[PDB]
Amino acid sequence: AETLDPLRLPLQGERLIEASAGTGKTFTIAALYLRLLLGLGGSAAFPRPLTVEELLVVTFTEAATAELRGRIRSNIHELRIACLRETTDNPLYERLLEEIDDKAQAAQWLLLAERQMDEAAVFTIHGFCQRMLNLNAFESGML
Amino acid sequence: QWEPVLTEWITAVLQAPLNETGVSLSQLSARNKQVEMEFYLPISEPLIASQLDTLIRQFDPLSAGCPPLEFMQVRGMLKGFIDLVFRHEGRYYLLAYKSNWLGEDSSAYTQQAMAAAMQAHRYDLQYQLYTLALHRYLRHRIADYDY
Amino acid sequence: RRGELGFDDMLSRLDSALRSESGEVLAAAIRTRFPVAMIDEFQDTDPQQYRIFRRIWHHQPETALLLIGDPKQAIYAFRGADIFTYMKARSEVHAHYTLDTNWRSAPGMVNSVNKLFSQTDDAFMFREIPFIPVKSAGKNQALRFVFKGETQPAMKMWLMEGESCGVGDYQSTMAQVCAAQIRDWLQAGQRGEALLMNGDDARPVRASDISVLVRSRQEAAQVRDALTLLEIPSVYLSNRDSVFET
Amino acid sequence: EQQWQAIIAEGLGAQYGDAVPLSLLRDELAQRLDQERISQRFLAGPVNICTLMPMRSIPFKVVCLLGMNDGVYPRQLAPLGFDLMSQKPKRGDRSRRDDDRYLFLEALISAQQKLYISYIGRSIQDNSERFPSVLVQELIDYIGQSHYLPGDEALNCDESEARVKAHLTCLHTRMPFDPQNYQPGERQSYAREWLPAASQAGKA
Amino acid sequence: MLRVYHSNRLDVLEALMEFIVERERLDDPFEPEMILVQSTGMAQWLQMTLSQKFGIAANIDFPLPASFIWDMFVRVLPEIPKESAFNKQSMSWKLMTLLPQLLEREDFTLLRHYLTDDSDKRKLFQLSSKAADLFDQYLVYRPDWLAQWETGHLVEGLGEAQAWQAPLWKALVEYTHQLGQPRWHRANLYQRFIETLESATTCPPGLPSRVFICGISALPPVYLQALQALGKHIEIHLLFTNPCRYYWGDIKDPAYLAKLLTRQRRHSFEDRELPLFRDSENAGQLFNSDGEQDVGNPLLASWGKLGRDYIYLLSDLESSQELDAFVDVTPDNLLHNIQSDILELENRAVAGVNIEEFSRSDNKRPLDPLDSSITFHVCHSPQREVEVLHDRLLAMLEEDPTLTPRDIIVMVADIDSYSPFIQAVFGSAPADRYLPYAISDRRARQSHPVLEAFISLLSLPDSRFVSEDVLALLDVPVLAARFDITEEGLRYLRQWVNESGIRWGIDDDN
Amino acid sequence: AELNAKTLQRLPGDNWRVTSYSGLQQRXXXXXXXXXXXXXXXXXXXX
Amino acid sequence: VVVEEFDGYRQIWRKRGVMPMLRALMSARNIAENLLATAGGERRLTDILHISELLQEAGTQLESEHALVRWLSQHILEPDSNASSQQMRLESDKHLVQI
Numbered sequence A: 001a002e003t004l005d006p007l008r009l010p011l012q013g014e015r016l017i018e019a020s021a022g023t024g025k026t027f028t029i030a031a032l033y034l035r036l037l038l039g040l041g042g043s044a045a046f047p048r049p050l051t052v053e054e055l056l057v058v059t060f061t062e063a064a065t066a067e068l069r070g071r072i073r074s075n076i077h078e079l080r081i082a083c084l085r086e087t088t089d090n091p092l093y094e095r096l097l098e099e100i101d102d103k104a105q106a107a108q109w110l111l112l113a114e115r116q117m118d119e120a121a122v123f124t125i126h127g128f129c130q131r132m133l134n135l136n137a138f139e140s141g142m143l
Numbered sequence B: 001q002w003e004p005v006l007t008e009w010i011t012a013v014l015q016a017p018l019n020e021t022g023v024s025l026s027q028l029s030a031r032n033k034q035v036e037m038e039f040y041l042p043i044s045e046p047l048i049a050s051q052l053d054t055l056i057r058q059f060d061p062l063s064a065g066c067p068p069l070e071f072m073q074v075r076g077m078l079k080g081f082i083d084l085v086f087r088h089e090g091r092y093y094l095l096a097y098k099s100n101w102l103g104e105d106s107s108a109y110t111q112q113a114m115a116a117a118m119q120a121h122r123y124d125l126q127y128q129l130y131t132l133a134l135h136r137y138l139r140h141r142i143a144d145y146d147y
Numbered sequence C: 001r002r003g004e005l006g007f008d009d010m011l012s013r014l015d016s017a018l019r020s021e022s023g024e025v026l027a028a029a030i031r032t033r034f035p036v037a038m039i040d041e042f043q044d045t046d047p048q049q050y051r052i053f054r055r056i057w058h059h060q061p062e063t064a065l066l067l068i069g070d071p072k073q074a075i076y077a078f079r080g081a082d083i084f085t086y087m088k089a090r091s092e093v094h095a096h097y098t099l100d101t102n103w104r105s106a107p108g109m110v111n112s113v114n115k116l117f118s119q120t121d122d123a124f125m126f127r128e129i130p131f132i133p134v135k136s137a138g139k140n141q142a143l144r145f146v147f148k149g150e151t152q153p154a155m156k157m158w159l160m161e162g163e164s165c166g167v168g169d170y171q172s173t174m175a176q177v178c179a180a181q182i183r184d185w186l187q188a189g190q191r192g193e194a195l196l197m198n199g200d201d202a203r204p205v206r207a208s209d210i211s212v213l214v215r216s217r218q219e220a221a222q223v224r225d226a227l228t229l230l231e232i233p234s235v236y237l238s239n240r241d242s243v244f245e246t
Numbered sequence D: 001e002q003q004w005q006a007i008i009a010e011g012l013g014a015q016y017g018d019a020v021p022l023s024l025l026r027d028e029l030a031q032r033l034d035q036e037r038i039s040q041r042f043l044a045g046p047v048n049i050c051t052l053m054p055m056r057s058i059p060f061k062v063v064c065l066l067g068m069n070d071g072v073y074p075r076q077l078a079p080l081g082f083d084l085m086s087q088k089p090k091r092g093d094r095s096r097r098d099d100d101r102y103l104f105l106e107a108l109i110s111a112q113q114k115l116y117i118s119y120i121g122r123s124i125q126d127n128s129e130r131f132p133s134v135l136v137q138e139l140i141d142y143i144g145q146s147h148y149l150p151g152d153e154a155l156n157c158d159e160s161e162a163r164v165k166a167h168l169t170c171l172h173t174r175m176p177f178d179p180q181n182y183q184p185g186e187r188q189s190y191a192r193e194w195l196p197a198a199s200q201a202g203k204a
Numbered sequence E: 001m002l003r004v005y006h007s008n009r010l011d012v013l014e015a016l017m018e019f020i021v022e023r024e025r026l027d028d029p030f031e032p033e034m035i036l037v038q039s040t041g042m043a044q045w046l047q048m049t050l051s052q053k054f055g056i057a058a059n060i061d062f063p064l065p066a067s068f069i070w071d072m073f074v075r076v077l078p079e080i081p082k083e084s085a086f087n088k089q090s091m092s093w094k095l096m097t098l099l100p101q102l103l104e105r106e107d108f109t110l111l112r113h114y115l116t117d118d119s120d121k122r123k124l125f126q127l128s129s130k131a132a133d134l135f136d137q138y139l140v141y142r143p144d145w146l147a148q149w150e151t152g153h154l155v156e157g158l159g160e161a162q163a164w165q166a167p168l169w170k171a172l173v174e175y176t177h178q179l180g181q182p183r184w185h186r187a188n189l190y191q192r193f194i195e196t197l198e199s200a201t202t203c204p205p206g207l208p209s210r211v212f213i214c215g216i217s218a219l220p221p222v223y224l225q226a227l228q229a230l231g232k233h234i235e236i237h238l239l240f241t242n243p244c245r246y247y248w249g250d251i252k253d254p255a256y257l258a259k260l261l262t263r264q265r266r267h268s269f270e271d272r273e274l275p276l277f278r279d280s281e282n283a284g285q286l287f288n289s290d291g292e293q294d295v296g297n298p299l300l301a302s303w304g305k306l307g308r309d310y311i312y313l314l315s316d317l318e319s320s321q322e323l324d325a326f327v328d329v330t331p332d333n334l335l336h337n338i339q340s341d342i343l344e345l346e347n348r349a350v351a352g353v354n355i356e357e358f359s360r361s362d363n364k365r366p367l368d369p370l371d372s373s374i375t376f377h378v379c380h381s382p383q384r385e386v387e388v389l390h391d392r393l394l395a396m397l398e399e400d401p402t403l404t405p406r407d408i409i410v411m412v413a414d415i416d417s418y419s420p421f422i423q424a425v426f427g428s429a430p431a432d433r434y435l436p437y438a439i440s441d442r443r444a445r446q447s448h449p450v451l452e453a454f455i456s457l458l459s460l461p462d463s464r465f466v467s468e469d470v471l472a473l474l475d476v477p478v479l480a481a482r483f484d485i486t487e488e489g490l491r492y493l494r495q496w497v498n499e500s501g502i503r504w505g506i507d508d509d510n
Numbered sequence F: 001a002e003l004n005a006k007t008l009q010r011l012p013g014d015n016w017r018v019t020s021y022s023g024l025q026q027r028x029x030x031x032x033x034x035x036x037x038x039x040x041x042x043x044x045x046x047x
Numbered sequence G: 001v002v003v004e005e006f007d008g009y010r011q012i013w014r015k016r017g018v019m020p021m022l023r024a025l026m027s028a029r030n031i032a033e034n035l036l037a038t039a040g041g042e043r044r045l046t047d048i049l050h051i052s053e054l055l056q057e058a059g060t061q062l063e064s065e066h067a068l069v070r071w072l073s074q075h076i077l078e079p080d081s082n083a084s085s086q087q088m089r090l091e092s093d094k095h096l097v098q099i
C-alpha cells in the first residue's frame, strides 16, 4: 500500500483507495472531479479533458448525492474564481493552480462545467441502473 | 341507423330558400362563405343591465317579453362564434344554427313559437350582440361601409 | 406482464442484460457514456454490482475506475451487501492507496479509538482487515469540550453497577441515565458554561448538536419516552411510521 | 367512442392485417384519454397560474416562479438514444433542456415590474437540504457580483457579495403560526387566522 | 418581401402589427388574416390586444407553422392530399408491419435480438411508435438524409445505428407505395415547392395577401428556406423579440462576417448595427473557428443558447429586410438594471481580477434596500410556499395603486403537482382577502370515474376479480344505473359480499 | 412582543371578465330563476 | 347551533373543496390556538395540518365529497410505508435531539 496524493494519483484502469473513517474519502472526490474536468496531473492525468456529463459518480444514499452534488458545484465555482484571480487562500486550489498551465482557458472550461452542473452525473446504483436502462433500451432489452 | 335518415334531411336544409331574397344555401360559393367566425368585442366601461335593457326594450319589440335581463356589472372582453356569414347581392347576412327541442317534431316551430323560444332562451340579446360584432368588423374591413 | 419494475429488479435486469450475448454491445455504449467512474462507499458492494463494474471497466484502455471504500465500515450485509466480494475486488486490483490522517474529530478522539482497537490483535478477526493507527490533523489540535469549567475527556464509558444484568434492566437504566446526562449538558448549555471549543472559539451546547445512536426502532422509542419524560423535545430521524397510524 | 374509433381508424387506414391483442389497444387508449389539456381561462383575467410553455411569452408586470428546486427545473427528457440527430447537431435543432433554459430567460425579459422567484430550501419533513436550480444560482450570482448594498461602500468583492445575496434571499418559516411572520415590518403576513396562535393567546 | 421586425419587447411588436393592419386593408372582406403562433395562449393574447385597439378582431387564422406550410403546398402545387401520407400515428401502424417482415435481414440483427425474445406484441409497438417519432423529426429537421436513404445511399460521418434505420425508411417509402397511398410527403415536397416559386409569375393563385409570424422564436431551417422563397410574392412579417439589441449571434467563417456587417434600419430614427465595427470581430468575441466567446452579458451567453441559433438563421436570409425597434429601459430598480444589462450587452460582473480592484466594493452598482423588483424566497413545503406567495401578491397589490390581478402570472415546473395547493390557499382566503385565480394547463379531466371504470373493463381478461375491485365498478353510479342498483341498496352489497364469503375470482373456470 | 397582521384596504380587484353571451343569462337568485326550459308541464292522457 | 355551523361547513366543503373547510373549522373552534396552548399539542397540530394537506392531494383526483371519506378510512387501515405519508418533523423552531 502507498500513501495517496490526490494530485499524484494516475487515473487509468482500476484504482482502489482505502483508508479509515473520517479520513476524507468523500472529501477527495471533489479534487479528483476537478482534476478530471481539466485533464491534470500530467503523466498521472487522464488522456483527455472530460465533460461534466461524462463523469460518473455513484454514492450510497440519495441524500449523499445531493450533498456531493452541491459541494462539487461550490468547488468548481471557487476554483474558477481563483483561476480568474490567479491567487487563492486555500492550499489545495493553490496546488491545482500551480499545476494548471493556461489559467484563462481553464476558467473557460470551468465556467462551461458550472453551467452543465444541472445534468451532472451523480447517482446511486439503484438510481444508476434506473437511468441507464431507460437510456439505452434495445441492448438492455427493456420497454 | 342515421345515414339514410340524415342525407335526405340535409338536402332539405341546403335547398330551403331564405328571407325575402329567397336565397338557397346551395347557391353560395366558397368565395362568399365565411365559416365559424370567432370574435372578441371589447366592452369599456362597466356594462350595467338596466342601463341596457331599457335601450333594448325601447327599440326592440322582442324585448317586451320577460323581465329585464339581469347580469352583474361587467367590464371586459366578449366572445362568440358566428355560425355562418355570407354575402348575397352585395349584401351580408348573419346565420346561426339552433337545434334542441326534445319534445316536438311538427309545427311546434312557427312564426309564433320560434319568436317564443327566442324570448325564452334570450337569443334576442345574443343576435343583437353579434350584429354589433359583425357591424364593427365590416366597418373595419370594408372601405366606405354603411350599415 | 404488467411491464413494471422494482429496485432489486432494476439491478438484476442490468446484470442479466450485460450477461446476455447481446449485452456486450450494451457495455460498449457505457464505456462511451462514462469513460470514468468513481464509486464511493464501495466497502458496501454486491456480487452483482462488482460483476457489472468489472465487466464494464475491468478491461479496455482509456477508461478509468476509482473504487473508494473502507472495509472496516461495511455494516449493510443485512441488505444484501457482502464484505467478501469487496475483498475479492481488493484482490483483483493491483494498486492500493491509503489516506493517512483523520480530519474528522478531536485529537483526543483519535487516540481513544486507536487505543480501543489496539487492545487485541486482529480486532476485526478477518486476516484481510488489519487495523492501523491513524493520526489527527493540525486543524483539530485545539479542539476541546468543556463542561462546568475543566475539559471533559474525549470519551466517557458509563459502567453499570451490580452483577448480572438482563437486557430489559439495561435498556431502562441506560436510556434513563443517558437522558439525565443529556439534560445536564443542556442546562449547562443555556448558561454558557459548557462549550464546544476550537481553540478560544466556542458555542453553547444546543440540543441540536447532541445525537443518540441506537441500533433498532424499539430501542429508539425506549430512548425517547424517557428522554421526553425529562421535557427535552426529541426527533427520531429514521422513523418510517406513517401519519395515518396516529 | 371518439378516441377509440380514432385509434382503430388510424390502424385501418394504414392497412394493418394481423390479429391484435387487446392489451395493445387498452394501453393506447389510456394515453389518448388524458392527452387533452384545458387552457381556456388563461387570460380571462383571474391571476394566472400555469406551467412554463415554450414560445408562449406574454409581457406582464409581475411574474412569479415556483418550484425552482434543483433537478425539478429544468425538465428532463433524454433523447431516445438511438437518435442520430442528438449525435451530430446542426443549428436549428430543438432540445427540451435548451427550451427550458431559454424560457427562464423569456420570463425574465417579460416581467415589467416585479420578478418573484421561489424554491424549497429545506424539506419540511426531515429538515433535509434542498437546492435552487442552476439557473437561479447563476442569477443570484450575477446580482451579487454586479451590486452592493449602500451600507458598506468599501468592504470587499466577495463580502459585499454574500452580504447582498443574504439581503435578497428571504427564508420563510416552517409553520404558518410561527410568530416571526407577524412581527411588524416589511414582510408581514396578511393571514389573520393564525394570528392568535402566533400570539400564543389561547387557553389550554 | 420578407420583413423582419426586431424588438426589445412584444408590446411594441403587437402595436406594429396593429399599424400594418391599419395602413393597408385587404380588398376581399372574407379573406381571413394569417398570423402564425406556436401556442393558443399567444393567440388569445393577440386577439385581446387587437380587438381593444380596433374595437374588434375576427377572421384571424392561427395555425402552426408546420400546419400552415403544409396547407400551402396544397395551394402552390397540384395533386397533394389535404393531410399527408406520413404521420406520427399512421407511420406507427405501417412500421408495425414492416418490422416483422424485415427481421433477420442480416442488417436489422440488433433489432432481432431486441424483439424475437418474446412478446404479446407490446415491445414491437413501443419500438414502432418511437421510430415513427424519429422519422417525423428527420422529415422536418433532416430531409436531406431521407433523400439519401430513399435512394439507398448512406450518409458519411453519421453515427452508428443509422444502418438499421435507413433500410427501414426505404422499406417504408416502398411499402407505402405498394399500398398506393399518395407518395407525397413533407421531405421530398418542400424542395420542389421552393423550386417552383423560384421561377414563377409573381401571382400564383390562392395564396393569402400577407402573413405574420408572431411570438415564435424557433423555426427549423427548412421553413425559413421556404418562406424566403415565398417572399417573392406574399408579404410576410417576422415579429421577433430578442433581448439584445446588438448581434449576439455566432459567426460562420471570417468571410461570413462581411455579409453580417450589413445594417438594421430603424423606423423610429436611423439605421443601426453592432458596436465597434470590425474591431469587435477580431477582439475576443468571434474567436478561433468557434462562435462568439465573451458574448457580453454572462447571463445571456449561458441561457440564450436557443435564440442564438435562431437569430443566426434570420440573418442568413438574402432577400430579408430587417428593421429594429428597441425601447431602451432606464435603469432604476434592480430588475431594470438586469433587463438593461441584457439589452445593451454589457458585463456588469465584478470579478476581482486584481487586488486593487478587489478591495473597494463601490464600483459595483448601488442597490436600494427598498427594491422588491427581484426577490428570492426560500420556503419549506409546496404548501407553505404557495401560502407565502399569496401574501406577497396581496402586499404587491396594496403597494401600488394600479395593479390588476390580470397583470400577475404564476409559473410552475409541473402544474399538476402544485394544483391542489393553489386551489387550497386561494380557495380558503376570506372575502376581503379573496382574490380570483385561474389555472391553465391542468390536465383536463372532465369525467374521472367513467373513464377509469371503463379501462378496468378492458382489463377484465387478466383481472382476478377481487371483491373490492368488482365493487369499485359499482361505485360509479352509472354502471350501477345500468344494473339499477340504488345507492341505498349498495350498502347491502358491501356487507353481503363481505359476509357471504366472496373473495377470489369469479367462477370455477376462472 | 406585540404583534399584528396588516390588512388590505383596497378591494382585491374589481371586475374585468372575458365572457360570452352565455356568461350573461347565467342564473337568477331570488324570485325569478332563468332556465332554457319551461317549468310548467302538462300530462297527456290520450293513449 | 352546532348542527347549524356544521351544516355551513358542508357548504364550504361542497363549494370550495376540503382544506378551506377544515380551515374554517379550525378558526371558528379556535383549536389551532388551543392546541399550541396545550403542552405537546404542537406535535398534534402538525399532524392535523399534514393530514389536511394530504386530503387535498387525494381530494382533487376524487370527484365525490363522499368518496373522500371513503378514501380516508382505507388509509387509516393500511398505513403502508410510503414516503409522503411519513410523519413530518414536529418543530424546527427549537434545536432537537436527533436520535
Ligand SMILES: Nc1ncnc2c1ncn2[C@@H]1O[C@H](COP(=O)(O)OP(=O)(O)NP(=O)(O)O)[C@@H](O)[C@H]1O
Pocket: A020, A021, A022, A023, A024, A025, A026, A027, A028, C070, C103, C104
Ligand atoms: N484534505 C482535507 N483538508 C481539510 N479538511 C478535510 C480534508 N479531508 C477531510 N476533511 C474534513 O474531515 C471530515 C471528514 O471527511 P469525509 O470526506 O467525510 O471523510 P470520509 O472518509 O468520507 N468519512 P466517512 O464517510 O464516515 O468514512 C469532513 O468534516 C471534512 O471537511
Ligand SMILES: [Mg+2]
Pocket: A025, A026, A027
Ligand atoms: Mg464519506
